């Protein structure tokens, strides 16, 4: 007895129509991926950085090593075309299968085939479907390994000489590194899994996850939930949906921080510099300018008594001064040539800064991820002129919003699933109100 | 009859004057920690170098603050987002100078408030209620997360989180307007609509129910005694209320379904405050309010100012003055 506005809840026990809904929806996702890439390609101009052009899909493809050469220069746009076209075409097939199952196909499945049919309360069938998708996911992660090691490699912003596409021959397998990341603190200078800073660790973790997912797929096909797990969970469609809602929320918050801090799997060449990066780059820019004028940036005392260009971190490292003292955990390929054992090396700073580093700093500083909703670039007090909002701000904000609502969706569906499972989701039974049979509090 | 099962029964008991529960097991200690540390820091903490420029800000009463100006001051900009527990400091003296208590207080408080929201689910389940009161409370909760955690994450430092104090709050607001133009951001505007409308519909609903109370008392007694706790009959006439309000506007602009009405009352401020929490949380990543600075120009190209440019003049004066000693380079990039 659902209302039209809760109308999709009518599909809970209609496995045939519910399959068509998922598959039709999968078609929409593939469609957008295809249409959006083509839209971005049709608008792309290779002489501009990707991040001056509102691109979020072409940087995902570039990062996989397609279409780019040394320094992130786009060399060939055809791989972009292919990815869009193939996605777009495939959406018709999923679209087709989705509307057939949702309209003409059998309304329910369990009578047509005991294999495809399922009952939410059938803990065995449920964990078998889980196992199937776990295997699919594991294969999916191994695909990224195959590309990295056998099909051209990945874009490496850290590669020597400006960054380049590089084949990964020694993926990191040491579980002390791979799972060391899972146990780093999420706080500044540690940054949990978001601190991954080399493709070897990226590929090696995907080897691991791929094996773990296939191991678990097989595990869940072969087993039924143990009694402690049976007594701990609600076993119902909505409960299962609420579990995935929590998981997607968590994953959305993680991705938010990934695009905001990480410049390895989101190369700044493609996405624009990070917040910390752009702030560091400003300090570098005026270090360089002032030292060319004759300033001794090592020994310049700023107004506060702290150094104007350089100071120490709380654990001693030589870092950029000013407000950017907060961003001293930033690591980037244009900066690291200047780091020695104690942080920034004053001798390298006086002698070894290269024009490409001057260029890269001036560029990143003038492309900090600040901008208005109507895409006026820079601080809120800047006049109109520059039409720019970093892809990082677009990707971070959108996914924080989505991550938040899915946490709200988790709470909504988890509480309802609990209440429905116990039988009081439609209200309190007047004739049997629990509180009226409890003793008074006082 | 087993020891553990007896413990589980007391924890989840619906006879405790205050419900404990499994969320309460995390909530009680974390809130007590935050509360005790806050009360002591507010009264006696020495000044804190919030901005990391060795310029300590006095926040506590015994250092010359009153109730309005006092605050527990955010931790040093030199710490950024680093975890700074007590045992990471050479001494309490160092931990106090650098803003240690702010971190201790807000982390315990975010945990305990999160468990507070869970506890609302939990008791609701023990009493056989519908479960979604905790969903209403996720709106204030998200807002606290936004100003204590999300905004510092996006800006790279807990020194830019909101200070735990009355004037500190206002400082946060003025700095936020200068850098994000939050007044011109749609998600703040929906927040104001959620909060103005919330106050409006609070007053409306309270006045309509009060207006249609059924006469049960004499002039010499509070009409409140016309209602007895647990009476089955309603205490007001909803058709009379509908009949008044439908004529004040027009019939179909009025609720006669009490359930739709009270759901409306729940949804409007909750959704509005979700958006304003999301506004803070997305300006954490510098997607700022609308910029119409110099959007109107004349046939020659002279700028023709609008009210937006006047806002910008105000915004600039907030910009150039805040943290007046902390900036060495011309762009306040974070």
């Amino acid at each position: 007895g659902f209302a039209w506005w809760a109308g999709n809840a009518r599909l809970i026990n209609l496995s045939g129509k519910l399959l068509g809904a998922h598959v039709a929806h999968a078609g929409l996702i593939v469609f957008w991926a295809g249409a959006m890439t083509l839209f971005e390609l049709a608008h792309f101009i290779p002489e501009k950085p990707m991040y001056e052009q509102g691109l979020i899909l072409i940087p995902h493809i570039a990062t996989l090593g397609w279409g780019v050469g040394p320094g992130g220069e786009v060399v060939d746009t055809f791989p972009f075309f292919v990815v869009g076209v193939v996605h777009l075409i495939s959406s018709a097939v999923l679209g087709f299968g989705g509307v057939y199952h949702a309209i003409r196909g059998p309304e329910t499945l369990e009578e047509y085939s005991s294999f495809f049919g399922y009952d939410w309360k059938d803990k065995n069938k449920m964990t078998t479907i889980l196992g199937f998708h776990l295997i699919v996911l594991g294969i999916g992660a191994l695909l990224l390994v195959a590309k990295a090691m056998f099909f051209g490699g990945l874009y490496d912003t850290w590669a020597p000489g400006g960054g380049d596409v590089r084949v990964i021959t020694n993926p990191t397998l040491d579980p002390r590194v791979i799972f060391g990341y899972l146990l780093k603190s999420p706080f500044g200078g540690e940054g949990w899994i978001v601190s991954v800073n080399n493709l070897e660790d990226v590929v090696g973790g995907h080897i691991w996850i791929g094996l773990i997912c296939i191991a678990g797929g097989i595990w869940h096909i072969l087993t039924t939930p143990f009694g402690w797990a049976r007594r701990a969970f609600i076993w119902s469609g909505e409960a299962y949906l609420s579990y995935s809602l929590g998981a997607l929320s968590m994953m959305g918050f993680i991705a938010t921080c990934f695009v905001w801090f990480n410049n390895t799997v989101y190369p700044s060449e493609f996405y624009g510099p990070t917040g910390p990066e752009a702030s560091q780059a400003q300090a570098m820019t005026f270090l360089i300018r002032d030292q060319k004028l004759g300033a001794n940036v090592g020994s310049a005392q700023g107004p506060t008594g702290l150094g104007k260009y350089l100071m120490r971190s709380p654990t001693g490292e030589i870092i950029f001064g000013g407000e950017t003292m907060r961003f001293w955990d930033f690591r980037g390929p244009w900066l690291e040539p200047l780091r020695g054992p104690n942080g920034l090396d004053l001798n390298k700073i006086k002698n070894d800064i290269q024009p490409w580093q001057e260029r890269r700093a001036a560029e990143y500083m003038t492309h900090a991820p600040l901008g208005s909703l109507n895409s006026v670039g820079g601080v809120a007090t800047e006049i109109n002129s520059v039409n720019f909002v970093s892809p990082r701000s677009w990707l971070a904000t959108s996914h924080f919003v989505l991550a938040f609502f899915f946490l709200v969706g988790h709470l909504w569906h988890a509480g309802r699933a609990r209440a429905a499972a116990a039988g009081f989701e439609k209200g309190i039974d007047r004739e049997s109100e629990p509180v009226l049979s409890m003793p008074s509090l006082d | 009859a087993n020891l553990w099962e007896r413990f589980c029964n007391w924890v989840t008991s619906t006879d405790n004057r205050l419900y404990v529960g499994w969320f309460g097991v995390i909530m009680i200690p974390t809130l007590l920690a935050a509360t005790i540390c806050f009360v002591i820091a507010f009264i006696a903490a020495p000044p804190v170098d919030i901005d990391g420029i060795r310029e300590p800000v006095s926040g506590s009463l015994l250092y010359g603050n009153n109730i309005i100006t006092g605050a527990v001051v955010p931790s040093s900009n030199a710490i950024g987002l680093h975890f700074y527990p007590i045992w990471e400091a050479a001494s309490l003296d160092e931990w106090l100078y650098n803003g240690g208590p702010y971190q201790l207080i807000i982390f315990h408080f975010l945990l305990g408030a999160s468990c507070y929201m869970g506890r609302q689910w939990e008791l609701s389940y023990r009493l056989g209620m519908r479960p979604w009161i905790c969903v209403a409370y996720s709106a204030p909760l998200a807002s606290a997360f936004a100003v204590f955690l999300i905004y510092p994450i996006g800006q790279g430092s807990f020194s830019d989180g909101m200070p735990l104090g009355i004037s500190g709050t206002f400082n946060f607001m003025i700095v936020f307007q200068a850098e994000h133009n939050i007044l011109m951001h749609p998600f703040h505007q929906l927040g104001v609509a959620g909060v103005f409308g919330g106050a409006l519909f609070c007053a409306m609903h309270g006045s309509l129910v009060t207006s249609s109370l059924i006469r049960e008392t004499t002039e010499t007694e509070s009409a409140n005694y016309g209602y007895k706790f647990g009476q089955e009959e309603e205490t007001y006439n909803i058709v009379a209320a509908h009949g008044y309000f439908g004529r004040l506007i027009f019939q179909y602009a009025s609720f006669n379904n009490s359930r739709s009405l009270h759901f409306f009352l729940a949804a409007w401020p909750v959704v509005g405050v979700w958006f304003t929490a999301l506004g803070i949380s997305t300006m954490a990543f510098n997607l700022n309010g609308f910029n119409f600075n110099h959007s109107v120009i004349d046939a020659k190209g002279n700028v023709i100012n609008t009210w937006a440019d006047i806002i910008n003049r105000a915004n600039l004066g907030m910009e150039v003055m805040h943290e007046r000693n902390a900036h060495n380079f011309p762009l306040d990039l974070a």
Binding site: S440, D442 | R17, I43, L61, N66, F229, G230, Q231
Partner: peptide, 30 residues
């Protein structure tokens, strides 16, 4: 004296919390 005054009022409010919760008029049914 102003610090004493501020803390005194605050402490009175916390004691009032204690009494309002644990020494309330108990709500009785019908």
């Amino acid at each position: 004296m102003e610090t004493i005054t501020y803390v005194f009022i605050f402490a009175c409010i916390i004691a009032l919390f204690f009494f309002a919760i644990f020494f309330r008029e108990p709500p009785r049914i019908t």
